[PDB]
Design an enzyme around this catalytic site. Structure first.
Site, short mmCIF file in Angstrom:
data_model
loop_
_atom_site.label_atom_id
_atom_site.label_comp_id
_atom_site.label_asym_id
_atom_site.label_seq_id
_atom_site.Cartn_x
_atom_site.Cartn_y
_atom_site.Cartn_z
N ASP A 1 0.92 -1.14 0.00
CA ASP A 1 0.00 0.00 0.00
C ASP A 1 0.93 1.15 0.00
OD1 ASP A 1 -2.85 1.51 -0.12
OD2 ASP A 1 -2.04 2.14 1.83
N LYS B 1 4.54 4.43 -2.75
CA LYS B 1 5.70 3.73 -3.37
C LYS B 1 5.81 3.79 -4.86
CE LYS B 1 7.17 -0.14 -1.49
NZ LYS B 1 8.62 0.30 -1.53
N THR B 2 5.25 2.80 -5.57
CA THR B 2 5.32 2.68 -7.05
C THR B 2 4.85 3.91 -7.80
OG1 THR B 2 4.78 0.30 -6.97
CG2 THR B 2 4.24 1.47 -9.03
N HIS C 1 8.20 -5.10 0.42
CA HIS C 1 7.46 -6.31 0.35
C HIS C 1 8.25 -7.29 1.04
CE1 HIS C 1 7.08 -3.75 -3.40
NE2 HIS C 1 6.00 -4.39 -3.82
#
Ligand code: GDP
Lengths: 205, 85, 393, 80
Positions: free
Chosen positions: C21, C24-25, C84
RNA sequence: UGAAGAGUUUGAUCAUGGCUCAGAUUGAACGCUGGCGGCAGGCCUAACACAUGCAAGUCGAACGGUAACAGGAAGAAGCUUGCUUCUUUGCUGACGAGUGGCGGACGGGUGAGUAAUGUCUGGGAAACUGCCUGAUGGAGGGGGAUAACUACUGGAAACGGUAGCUAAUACCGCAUAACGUCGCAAGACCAAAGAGGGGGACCUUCGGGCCUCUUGCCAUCGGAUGUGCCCAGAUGGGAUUAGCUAGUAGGUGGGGUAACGGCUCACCUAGGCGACGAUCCCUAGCUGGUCUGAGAGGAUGACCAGCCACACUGGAACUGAGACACGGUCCAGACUCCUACGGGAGGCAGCAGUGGGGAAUAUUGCACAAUGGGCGCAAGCCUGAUGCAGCCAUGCCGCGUGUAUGAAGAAGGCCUUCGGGUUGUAAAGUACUUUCAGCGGGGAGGAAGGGAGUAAAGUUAAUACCUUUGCUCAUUGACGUUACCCGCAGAAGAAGCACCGGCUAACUCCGUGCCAGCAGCCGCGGUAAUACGGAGGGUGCAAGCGUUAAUCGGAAUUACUGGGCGUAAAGCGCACGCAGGCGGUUUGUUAAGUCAGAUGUGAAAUCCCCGGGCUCAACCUGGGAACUGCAUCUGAUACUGGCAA
RNA sequence: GCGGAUUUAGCUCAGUUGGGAGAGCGCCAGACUGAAGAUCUGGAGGUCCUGUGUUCGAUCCACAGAAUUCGCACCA
């Protein structure tokens, strides 16, 4: 290899000296010579045939310092000449620079004669070399250099030179540190421990 | 694809359809002689022999008969009429 | 053929961390096209035909992005760093490369597993600065939520061994921004200023002997074999001899280039993420975990007496007294290999909170030098932190 | 096609050249027509390292075939 | 100047015969080990697929030109003023592109195909041959064009279409027509290209004509060289391959090729081939040569040279003296890639690299210096040809890692009736040396040429030009501070690997105990192992050593040299007989076989004989012989064969 | 780097799967010869792949590692 190990220990089971640390010493002088170089890794007995037959092959081989290959090659030039195969071989073996110098009194030891040529203190004619093999021939001129009429090693090998007859086929000059290799060797008088017939049988297949 | 003078290919397009016509004009005239041979004629086979005689000759001078064919190909078509004569 | 780049401004390694969640990306991509308008611009560009295959395939937030860019302040090399659970092992090393980390944490949620984990992993052997970003503040509409959440972001920093005493907190919503929601794009320009305000710049030595971890090893489509990494210390001038000192293999290789992402350098200096090119040696002959070094470096070893500090269970750490015959895992730099505890006499039993000197037998030699810092993880958490006190054969 | 030319037969860092009449569709080391000469560029004193004939450098140059610059300059210095 | 055997069947023995070892070798691999340097070699397999970069251009001296750069001139500006700045202009350097000529048909790589009018040896006849070169003769006068360019106009690109203009050593007439060609003859018929430098007398509308030289052009007949074509002979294996053939075999007449030919056809005849092995099947590029070997022989075809064949697959044609053009075209096909989704593009068996395969085989390096090659009348430009460098003990060669001296002979080991023995002059200890590495500093040579001037004794204009000649001058070096040479400290920085039961040189002490393990063969080990393991010692080789694979040798154990068949492996169960092989005796003839001689040829390389050149050697190289052989030319007549009696 | 799956006497395989380890072969011993067999009489044989965590108790459950295998991921 050029060895670099325990010269006189070889004498023991050579049964001859063949000039191992000659200058003050030889057999049974400050050394244990004429034994067996093992405790019982090797000790004296009756001897085998094949023993002899290998040993003598190496006898001739070791008193020039020639490797495996070389001495065979000399044999392949001898048995290419239509003259005497036996003679020819011992003729080619004496063409090595290292052997010639010893027999001009330069070096008290065979090993020392060859350890001169190493350090830059040798030369042949006006040519400088550091090569322990050369083409040595009639009316060549063996020459010491400048800074080799200066070394105190060279002089100290003239001692023994007064004590060895020196060959008759070379001029020898120590007074200006020259001498010429004016003519061919004689082996009418060095084949006195050399049986050519033995070794040339073995080399043959 | 890259060639220094890949234009060479286009240049030959010109010289392969120039040659073409000169030769096929020469081949229609050989068919005109042969007409007259089946008529038994020396008066229409020979309106087609000496009329292709400068033709045949001047095209050997364009090199389009070629080599030892061009020292042969004024005798090859001479041959024709002589059978009939 | 290929291009040219050169070393202009100091090259600072940064990245985006967190838990799953967050921003980040979306922040990664977001930031760059915003900044690119304002601090970039060049005409008849590479970019605009070749959209955008190389990035999806060569990374996934594995360890790295080969983005180079200069900001008008410094140069930024961004490496996109896991958050992750599945990659937890990787992320220690990546942050170990880092000089500041953009810790995006979504303001909607609290501390999640990887948010606590990371800050604790940071302080010890990784990143020394954390730059907090509350994200999702077009989904927090109330400053009284914001306030509250901030105060617990403080508490993580301040006793997970960083100043909680102020950090610049940047407050926006990522996915909104990028599209054309101007209110957050404006803030994106303030990120090149918090990369100065809070960090500001590392001091790396480039005059040491060479040292580099593995990052990625390739056998390119038409040139030879390439190894990547961030030069830790020392330098690699184009055309060179090197020695790659490592695990059970020691390789000699010759270096015949050092590009920086096919934009060619004539050096590879410390602080730079670079590519390297070699003649000889194919890719499976190179194992991961070796270090690229000079011909002059130390040789590998197995055994060494060490000086290790046994941490306690409160800040994470042991909670059962432990004996001979354990198998904890030693990170030294790039990778890990198992080493066993053995305690020189006068010691057999070792409790939480100890200090101790113990003599190690790793299950492979790894290129070892005195003083070499390490972490010791078992069960996936740090047992102690230690140094190699005296190498032995 | 055939031409007068020089033609190495030396080893490494030995320039022993041999003047040959040889082909340009094979090579200077390939199909020879004939030797015709030897040449030293280093001007060695070995046994016959310089030959250049009179008779074939006066017959195959009759129907044409050109020589080389050292050769050109050698015609005069053997005073042929 | 030229070849040796040993061990191993058996209670013992002698034969017969297999087995194994000692040799020599390699485009070798592997394991361990690793100081230097010179010379050589280095993807053998998936001819599997390839990112990229490079490997194929050059002449302005045939052109029409001016896109860029730089000047010349020109007007002009700034009067940034006699100096900066701006526009103009093909004028000149110089040259973008485009027309024109020649290379890209070579060189390079590979051995997949390929038992071959393909290769090799030896002949032959009906041919070609640009570049090359000899001789003689010529180059006369016209026309029509069209690129570029220009104006439009289509596509994402690739790549176009209109419309207009123009040049030539481009194109096409026309003229001239032999020592031409065709034609028995009489006759008939066919060629082009000029461009450059220079110049005195003249002429010009001043661009040039005139003149002289020079290169290039056209024709005809030769020569050279290189290349097609034919033939014979030699070319691998299998009859668990025996039957084969319709342009098939041949003959006419047609046609075709450069030329000879069913090369192709129409017709005609119905033949041709085969066990001296056809047809078919397996496998393979071939040769000089290579390896080994006393030789004969066998094996083999790496680098090097020659030949042949192939270039994504298949097929096909164009121009040309030359191509089915590796990096030319087109068509079909499968791949592969791009895309504006309409459509296009591509082919590393070229070099260097890539990935995959494999036991294994190297850097996307530097450079035109030099050698050679290409274009050009030159200058000059071009070159993964080449010269260099690099990587790899893949191999051949050279040298070094120190010399001397030094004993009760040092501890320290190891073995030991415990007297000692051994390691051992080995060490310590003493002097003596610094090669080679390392450091500092010089440095030959590989360069001849071309370029700027001057001499001509040619040619013409007497002068030019052009070419020639010597001289004069500034220089041509990639490798790389090269060979080498000098100095500088300091034994310093430089030994390993296998083996020691018998073949086979080279053992002791322990631990183990037919276990562990060893092992080329014969064979080891059952708790006092010269054979296993460690240690100590000993032995052979040495920057290598040992192991394997592989080929020949030994092996005369496939035997022409050089083998057996009563019983050792082998004689059809026995006759007959076709092909084949073989032929008493005498004379005449022939000269095919055969003997002699002669002549070509038998590539270079390679061997040898003699002999040199590199600091030696490795390596480099000269001359002679060899080139065993083959065909041809002429003789000989004993033997062999034919013929005759 | 990332995901599965799997190791129980020397050998061949059971077993629980929160609760306490067998069978078969094969050994090894005492006995005959020196050893072994035929045969005779006696005994021994698991870090349950490894390391942790939980509980009075882990071979079982949970988690880390190692080794096997089996899928993934990578052109500076
Ligand atoms: N509304 C909202 N959604 C967001 C925002 N940032 C990210 N997202 C979405 O949430 C996803 C997961 O968040 P991200 O940090 O990228 O996570 P990871 O790759 O799973 O670690 C993104 O990929 C977006 O689809 C935000 O600021 N606002």
């Amino acid at each position: 290899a050029r060895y670099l190990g325990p010269k006189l220990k070889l004498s023991r089971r050579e049964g001859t000296d063949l000039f191992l640390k000659s200058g003050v010493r030889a057999i049974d002088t400050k050394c244990k010579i004429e034994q067996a170089p093992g405790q019982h890794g090797a000790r004296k007995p009756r001897l085998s045939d094949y023993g002899v037959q290998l040993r003598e092959k190496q006898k001739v081989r070791r008193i020039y310092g020639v490797l495996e290959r070389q001495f065979r090659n000399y044999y392949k030039e001898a048995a290419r000449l239509k003259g005497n195969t036996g003679e020819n071989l011992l003729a080619l073996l004496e063409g090595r620079l290292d052997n010639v110098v010893y027999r001009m009194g330069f070096g008290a030891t065979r090993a020392e004669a060859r350890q001169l040529v190493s350090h830059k203190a040798i030369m042949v004619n006006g040519r400088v070399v550091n090569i322990a093999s050369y083409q040595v021939s009639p009316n060549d001129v063996v020459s010491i250099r400048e800074k080799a009429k200066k070394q105190s090693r060279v002089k100290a090998a003239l001692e023994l030179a007064e004590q060895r007859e020196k060959p008759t086929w070379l001029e020898v000059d120590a007074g200006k540190m020259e001498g010429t290799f004016k003519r061919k060797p004689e082996r009418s008088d060095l084949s006195a421990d050399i049986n050519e017939h033995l070794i040339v049988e073995l080399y043959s297949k | 694809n890259i060639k220094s003078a890949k234009k060479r290919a286009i240049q030959s397009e010109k010289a392969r359809k120039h040659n073409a016509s000169r030769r096929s004009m020469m081949r229609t005239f050989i068919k005109k002689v042969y007409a007259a041979i089946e008529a038994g004629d020396k008066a229409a086979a020979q309106k087609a022999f000496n009329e292709m005689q400068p033709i045949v000759d001047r095209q050997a001078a364009k090199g389009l008969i070629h080599k030892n064919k061009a020292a042969r190909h004024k005798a090859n078509l001479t041959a024709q009429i002589n059978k009939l004569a | 053929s290929k291009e040219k780049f050169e070393r202009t401004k100091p090259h600072v390694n940064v990245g985006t961390i967190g838990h799953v969640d967050h921003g980040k990306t979306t922040l990664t991509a977001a930031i760059t096209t915003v900044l690119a308008k304002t601090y970039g611009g060049a005409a008849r560009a590479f970019d605009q035909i070749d959209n955008a295959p190389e990035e999806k395939a060569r990374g996934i937030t594995i360890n790295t992005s080969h983005v180079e860019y200069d900001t008008p302040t410094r140069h930024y090399a961004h490496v996109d760093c896991p958050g992750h659970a599945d990659y937890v092992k990787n992320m220690i090393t990546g942050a170990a490369q880092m000089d500041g980390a953009i810790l995006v944490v979504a303001a909607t949620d609290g501390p999640m597993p990887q948010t606590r984990e990371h800050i604790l992993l940071g302080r010890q052997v990784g990143v020394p600065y954390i730059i907090v970003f509350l994200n999702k503040c077009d989904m927090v509409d109330d400053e009284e939520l914001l306030e509250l959440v901030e105060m617990e972001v403080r508490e993580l920093l301040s006793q997970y061994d960083f100043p909680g005493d102020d950090t610049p907190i940047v407050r926006g919503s990522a996915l909104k921004a990028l599209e054309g929601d101007a209110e957050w794009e404006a803030k994106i320009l303030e990120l090149a200023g918090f990369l100065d305000s809070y960090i500001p710049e590392p001091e790396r030595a480039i005059d040491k002997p060479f040292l580099l971890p593995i990052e990625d090893v390739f056998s390119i489509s038409g040139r030879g074999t390439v190894v990547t990494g961030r030069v830790e210390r020392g330098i690699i001038k184009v055309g060179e001899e090197v020695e790659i000192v490592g695990i059970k293999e020691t390789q000699k290789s010759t270096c015949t280039g050092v590009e920086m992402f096919r934009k060619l350098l004539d050096e590879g200096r410390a602080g730079e993420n670079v590519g390297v090119l070699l003649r000889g040696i194919k890719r499976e002959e190179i194992e991961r975990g070796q270090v690229l070094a000079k011909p002059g470096t130390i040789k590998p070893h197995t055994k060494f007496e060490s000086e290790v500090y046994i941490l306690s269970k409160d800040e994470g750490g042991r909670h059962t007294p432990f004996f001979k015959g354990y198998r904890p895992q030693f990170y030294f730099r790039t990778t890990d290999v198992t080493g066993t505890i053995e305690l020189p006499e006068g010691v057999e039993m070792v409790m939480p909170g100890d200090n101790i000197k113990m003599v190690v037998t790793l299950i492979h030699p790894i290129a070892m030098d005195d003083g070499l810092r390490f972490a010791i993880r078992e069960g996936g958490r740090t047992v102690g932190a230690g140094v190699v006190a005296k190498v032995l054969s | 096609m055939v031409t007068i030319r020089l033609a190495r037969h030396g080893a490494k860092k030995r320039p022993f050249y041999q003047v040959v009449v040889a082909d340009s569709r094979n090579a200077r080391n390939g199909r020879f027509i004939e030797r015709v000469g030897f040449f030293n560029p280093i001007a060695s004193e070995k046994e016959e390292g310089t030959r250049l004939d009179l008779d074939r450098i006066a017959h195959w140059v009759g129907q044409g075939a050109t020589i080389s610059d050292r050769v050109a300059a050698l015609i005069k210095e053997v005073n042929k």
